[PDB]
Design an enzyme around this catalytic site. Sequence first.
Site, mmCIF file in Angstrom:
data_model
loop_
_atom_site.group_PDB
_atom_site.id
_atom_site.type_symbol
_atom_site.label_atom_id
_atom_site.label_comp_id
_atom_site.label_asym_id
_atom_site.label_seq_id
_atom_site.Cartn_x
_atom_site.Cartn_y
_atom_site.Cartn_z
ATOM 1 N N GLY A 99 52.320 39.179 92.128
ATOM 2 C CA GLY A 99 52.674 40.197 93.114
ATOM 3 C C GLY A 99 52.692 39.693 94.549
ATOM 4 C CB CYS B 279 57.082 37.176 94.649
ATOM 5 S SG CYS B 279 56.382 36.370 93.181
ATOM 6 C CG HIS C 178 62.094 36.183 91.536
ATOM 7 N ND1 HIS C 178 61.060 37.056 91.258
ATOM 8 C CD2 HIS C 178 61.648 35.244 92.397
ATOM 9 C CE1 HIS C 178 60.032 36.649 91.988
ATOM 10 N NE2 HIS C 178 60.339 35.563 92.693
HETATM 11 C C1 LIG Z 1 48.323 31.729 87.554
HETATM 12 N N1 LIG Z 1 48.312 33.184 87.461
HETATM 13 S S1 LIG Z 1 48.447 34.051 88.812
HETATM 14 O O1 LIG Z 1 47.583 33.444 89.776
HETATM 15 O O2 LIG Z 1 48.245 35.421 88.450
HETATM 16 C C2 LIG Z 1 50.102 33.887 89.384
HETATM 17 C C3 LIG Z 1 51.151 34.301 88.574
HETATM 18 C C4 LIG Z 1 52.429 34.262 89.044
HETATM 19 C C5 LIG Z 1 52.716 33.808 90.358
HETATM 20 C C6 LIG Z 1 54.034 33.770 90.912
HETATM 21 N N2 LIG Z 1 55.135 34.035 90.060
HETATM 22 C C7 LIG Z 1 55.989 33.132 89.525
HETATM 23 O O3 LIG Z 1 55.897 31.928 89.712
HETATM 24 C C8 LIG Z 1 57.109 33.723 88.609
HETATM 25 O O4 LIG Z 1 57.308 35.023 89.189
HETATM 26 C C9 LIG Z 1 58.082 35.965 88.441
HETATM 27 C C10 LIG Z 1 56.452 33.692 87.213
HETATM 28 C C11 LIG Z 1 57.422 33.292 86.117
HETATM 29 O O5 LIG Z 1 58.125 32.078 86.432
HETATM 30 C C12 LIG Z 1 58.809 32.130 87.621
HETATM 31 C C13 LIG Z 1 59.968 31.372 87.682
HETATM 32 C C14 LIG Z 1 60.702 31.349 88.852
HETATM 33 C C15 LIG Z 1 60.274 32.089 89.932
HETATM 34 CL CL1 LIG Z 1 61.154 31.983 91.433
HETATM 35 C C16 LIG Z 1 59.132 32.872 89.879
HETATM 36 C C17 LIG Z 1 58.371 32.889 88.712
HETATM 37 C C18 LIG Z 1 54.153 33.361 92.240
HETATM 38 N N3 LIG Z 1 53.139 32.969 93.024
HETATM 39 C C19 LIG Z 1 51.924 32.978 92.502
HETATM 40 C C20 LIG Z 1 51.629 33.386 91.178
HETATM 41 C C21 LIG Z 1 50.316 33.421 90.652
#
Ligand SMILES: CNS(=O)(=O)c1ccc2c(NC(=O)[C@]3(OC)CCOc4ccc(Cl)cc43)cncc2c1
Lengths: 299, 302
Positions: free
Chosen positions: A137, A139, A41
Amino acid sequence: SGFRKMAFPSGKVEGCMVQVTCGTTTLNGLWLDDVVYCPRHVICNPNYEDLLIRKSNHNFLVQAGNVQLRVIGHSMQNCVLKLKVDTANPKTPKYKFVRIQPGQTFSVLACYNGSPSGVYQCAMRPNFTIKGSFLNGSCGSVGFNIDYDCVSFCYMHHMELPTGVHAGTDLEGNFYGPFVDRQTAQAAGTDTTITVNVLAWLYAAVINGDRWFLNRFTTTLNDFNLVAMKYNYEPLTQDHVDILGPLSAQTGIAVLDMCASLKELLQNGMNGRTILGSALLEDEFTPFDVVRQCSGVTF
Amino acid sequence: SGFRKMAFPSGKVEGCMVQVTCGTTTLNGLWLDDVVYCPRHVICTSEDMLNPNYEDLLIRKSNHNFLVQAGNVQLRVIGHSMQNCVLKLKVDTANPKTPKYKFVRIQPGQTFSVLACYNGSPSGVYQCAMRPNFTIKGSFLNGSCGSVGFNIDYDCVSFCYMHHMELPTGVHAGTDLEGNFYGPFVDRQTAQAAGTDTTITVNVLAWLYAAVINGDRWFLNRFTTTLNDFNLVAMKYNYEPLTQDHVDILGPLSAQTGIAVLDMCASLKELLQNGMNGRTILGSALLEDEFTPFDVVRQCSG
Ligand SMILES: CNS(=O)(=O)c1ccc2c(NC(=O)[C@]3(OC)CCOc4ccc(Cl)cc43)cncc2c1
Ligand SMILES: CNS(=O)(=O)c1ccc2c(NC(=O)[C@]3(OC)CCOc4ccc(Cl)cc43)cncc2c1
Ligand SMILES: [Cl-]
């Protein structure tokens, strides 16, 4: 004495972390030999074959410390992108890619912009999620175990579910669980307690002098599984009983004898008491983790 | 999202761990530049441990009596000196893996990462806090002496602890990297005991703010309290007194969530009175005190 949640030393994995930037997206990559592995992604209903075919090698900016690596090839394997680079990582340790089963534990090196910021230990939940600690970030951060000097890479972080739990893949890009790498409605299934792990942690408490929960009783494997199913605990198999053998022999408490303790704890609670400083039954230590920590194995 | 007990990446410290042997005693050493630091009781036999005269034991030693091993390579000891309860072995090679580092003495309530080692080999990493009674609740077996506690700031390693002994309750005692013990302990096998331990109040409050940032509000209430009334209640549950310094330190978290420190103090008073009633806070049925206000901000914001 003492019993802590302990991760493997992260140094062999730190020497493999790089930053991967494509367009406006930046995440972490794992540099082993002349290949950088990262979530696909980074190129983002996505058609990954269509999005990838439009990219050239110079679109992917790979940074290892203050040095830019040159990408000379790219290919996709399931949900992981593999970037061929001109230079082999001189810090590449002895490694394997392994797919783990639910209940197994591993160390996570959480990274941001190709820089390691923390290490923690966790378990693959029976619902295939991990209860991690990740921000935007993160990922591309990886999960691993160490056996002697060989790093077994078992997890790559991809996403956060709406409940705050995390989903990812093995290093061959196959997701753990029924998840997909797309922005769509997804949810973690109902979770259960890892029974073999709770039993291993009760043996660790006994080795550390915490014995109040022990009782004179035993139970059959069938009667214990009937009780465990009622409390959303995973079934205990004969393989789990065999795996607990060494701990059973060391403490003198047969596995089914420790099951009668667990049954009494589930039906009556702890009654103000604690086990290893915890008021809840801990399930993120495997039988092997308990033996390793209560004997001091080194890497 | 998520909240885990998180240790710093241990790689910069792994490249410093060596094995130090003196006769029949073997423990861990920390090799930085051309010096190896280790507990001075490496010069003791099990017989010497009750009332050892380290100055007298050390004067009888020569450089070749100390065997230092870094991986499969033996380092040559060219000098030795004692500084408080640490022995400093000058070696003939500077460690090429020496990171940017500092020696810092910490205060109770502060947290750090421990790289547990045996025979100069790292076996695990975990997160600790210096208890108010100056002990650490570690996980250490025989031969763990010399294992170190640390924090990382950017690329700088702050060494704050070196492991020396296990008290009879299973808790651990050690020194800063200048050999000064934390607490009223001595590196002698004379009868010693950990003092009554208390809960690190500022850390519990910081962890309640981490729960609010992660969406948990069930424990909040409409009340506030004076700092004195809070401390009168807290002492009854064996909680450390909360000082104005602690209130000031919690300011940033208070501003981010919108809950004043004394208002969060009123939630804590209520939790101590009612318990959790079958509920958990950040996956825990007990009030967590091994996260500082600084740890909460780092893990929740970056
Ligand atoms: C709850 N806010 S945060 O703690 O800043 C956060 C934000 C994004 C986080 C993150 N990212 C994701 O899940 C996404 O990355 C582009 C956001 C959009 O939806 C998708 C859909 C599919 C896939 Cl594979 C990835 C994503 C990962 N791990 C932790 C994350 C904590
Ligand atoms: C409880 N058994 S164990 O887990 O194997 C163990 C044994 C010794 C442990 C240990 N060692 C020590 O405390 C001593 O080391 C020579 C043992 C004799 O008494 C003293 C007195 C003073 C000083 Cl500074 C050190 C020691 C350290 N940390 C953890 C230890 C776990
Ligand atoms: Cl401090």
